[PDB]
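In practice, a research group might receive sequence data for several interacting partners and want a quick structural hypothesis before committing to experiments. The following worked case mirrors that situation: the sequences arrive first, and a predicted assembly follows.
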Amino acid sequence: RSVVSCPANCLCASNILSCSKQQLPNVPQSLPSYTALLDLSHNNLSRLRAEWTPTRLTNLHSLLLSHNHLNFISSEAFVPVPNLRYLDLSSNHLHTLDEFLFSDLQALEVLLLYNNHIVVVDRNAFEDMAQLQKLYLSQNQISRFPVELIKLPKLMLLDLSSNKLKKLPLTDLQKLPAWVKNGLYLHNNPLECDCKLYQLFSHWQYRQLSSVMDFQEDLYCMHSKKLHNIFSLDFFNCSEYKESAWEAHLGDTLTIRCDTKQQGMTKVWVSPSNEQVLSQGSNGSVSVRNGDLFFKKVQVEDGGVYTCYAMGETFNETLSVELKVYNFTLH
Amino acid sequence: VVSCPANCLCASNILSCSKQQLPNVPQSLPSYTALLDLSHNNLSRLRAEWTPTRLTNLHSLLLSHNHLNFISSEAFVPVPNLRYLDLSSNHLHTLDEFLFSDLQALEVLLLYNNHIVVVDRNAFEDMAQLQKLYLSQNQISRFPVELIKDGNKLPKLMLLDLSSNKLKKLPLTDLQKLPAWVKNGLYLHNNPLECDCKLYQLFSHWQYRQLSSVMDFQEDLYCMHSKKLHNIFSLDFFNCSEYKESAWEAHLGDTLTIRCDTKQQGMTKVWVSPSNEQVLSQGSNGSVSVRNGDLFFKKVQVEDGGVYTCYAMGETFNETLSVELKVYNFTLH
Ligand SMILES: *[C@@H]1O[C@H](CO)[C@@H](O[C@@H]2O[C@H](CO)[C@@H](O[C@@H]3O[C@H](CO)[C@@H](O)[C@H](O)[C@@H]3O)[C@H](O)[C@H]2NC(C)=O)[C@H](O)[C@H]1NC(C)=O
Ligand SMILES: *[C@@H]1O[C@H](CO)[C@@H](O[C@@H]2O[C@H](CO)[C@@H](O[C@@H]3O[C@H](CO)[C@@H](O)[C@H](O)[C@@H]3O)[C@H](O)[C@H]2NC(C)=O)[C@H](O)[C@H]1NC(C)=O
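A structural hypothesis for the assembly, expressed as tokens:
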């Protein structure tokens, strides 16, 4: 009749436990160690306690806890689930993400935290999360941009839409790889209206980043109250947006990235002499490392426009960078 | 922050539209949608035009806990790049031919806890990427051997959950021939299987191999003969012979391939010879070569006899598999 290992209030489909919409105030007892996906959504959990599971769950890859009343998560809550890849904590009552809260989840690739009551995000909430690619933080009350996350090595989607962001670290945002910008969602926030902000988003629009293209109508700033679509604002003394032009001193060591929109594309660099920059030796001058331009000791004769021809499955990109070599220092 | 359809929460590329007792799918679904959650609603039909838009960015479609009793033969035309589809806990009664054939990138299909009585092999035709199919808690009485039998198999299917159905008979000779990586995810527990010794011998082997399909569910692997339930692993007590290993016998000059029959794909295989030397190579007179990850004898010699060991190395576990070769000093042709 019933599966012996199946906890109360669950439908057990081999390694899937469907325990949703069961009015549960606590996690079912005696969860089996073979569990791969635990769906506890639409319940009435308020605390994810230390020892919510006395056993393992070394096989657990997905934990779904959305639509509960979670307002507390133990500092020990993720010790039992080391191999977790996907965690849905959306639609809960979470308010503050303490230091080291998710730091045990070193295999996690997706974290959903949208539609909570989050007012504070600690600088160390996500420390050690090396595998994390997507972090959804929409529909909260976050007012401090989590600058530490972009100053998470694999993070390629950071959704901070529908929050209380006003001030942005624009210089940090400018230096971000285009593959991160592509998934950095800042729509539906009372951002400060500013020429530099227009310039940031206008660049992203030129590059056709999804973050802008998908949400153009929702990209707001706010000036003395009011709220305006950023692209509706014509700023005085505000230039179009600057082409990419590294400046170096004679003798510098320097790496220049091919700033593609998406990872894993095929990159070929062509020098200003119209020669292919080769990956080969450890001698000088210019070479390609990892897919970036590398100059061991920049010379006057280096410099000019280098072009990276990048090829993907769905699109290509042609990105130019001007190296300007200065024969003097101004300090 | 809309573009957001009426009864949905839109979090960039995620639409969460669950538990709103919707009788139809929200209108004007945005093309940027990556995951669409319409679970715990009142949908009864997934019609040809559930989405006029076309959701080429959709990878997950969650439709569990609805009242779905009908899916259009064109329902999956708009979601060509779908990887994960949950149709569990619905009222689905038949799996019509070619029903999922538009889902050529689908990796996981959940159909557990429905009213499915009969599985048509053609419902899953051309699903080249389908890795996991969950069909537990239905009323299935015939084992769909065509899903996994060499000839017309789904090539990447590595988990087939048929637990908690109405299975009485299995195609045991067909199941024995399967690679252990398929057997490892073939779940047959909590079915009224007829007790017989061939049944015991199959599961006895799987148990010795520590396949998850057995190790995780030993207590739910039961059989009926007669109207009383027995645990399959009690059949040794009833005088059934244990699992019989294991030849292998060759004649001089034979050409022979021996698989390292590991329970997970993608493991590194290292073969060692009866003389305790690594096999190696692919030249290859003649006389131990390793090809793909298989032991290969182009022309068996009497010196080639003995026990060969395959050490298989994976991320989470390792296996050691031994095969004994016996060589006759003559050839019958
Ligand atoms: C979801 O779980 C919570 C936590 O148990 C439930 O909240 C609790 O609801 C009960 C009413 O069912 C409240 O009981 C009352 O408590 C006060 C003292 O606090 C007492 O004076 C009353 O006589 C009464 O017994 C309880 O306060 C409340 N606890 C909390 C922390 O809010 C909730 O009902 C559960 N929801 C469902 C619908 O399953
Ligand atoms: C969403 O789907 C659920 C399906 O369960 C609907 O709930 C069901 O609603 C019907 C009424 O439409 C309820 O039936 C009633 O039963 C009583 C007593 O026998 C009878 O006097 C009424 O005339 C009617 O037949 C039924 O109890 C209820 N089922 C459950 C499980 O709660 C719900 O109506 C649907 N929502 C929408 C918005 O369509």
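Before designing any experiment, note the following. Chain A has two domains: 1-245, 246-331. The pocket of ligand 2 is lined by residues B 21, 23, 42 (CB under 6 Å).
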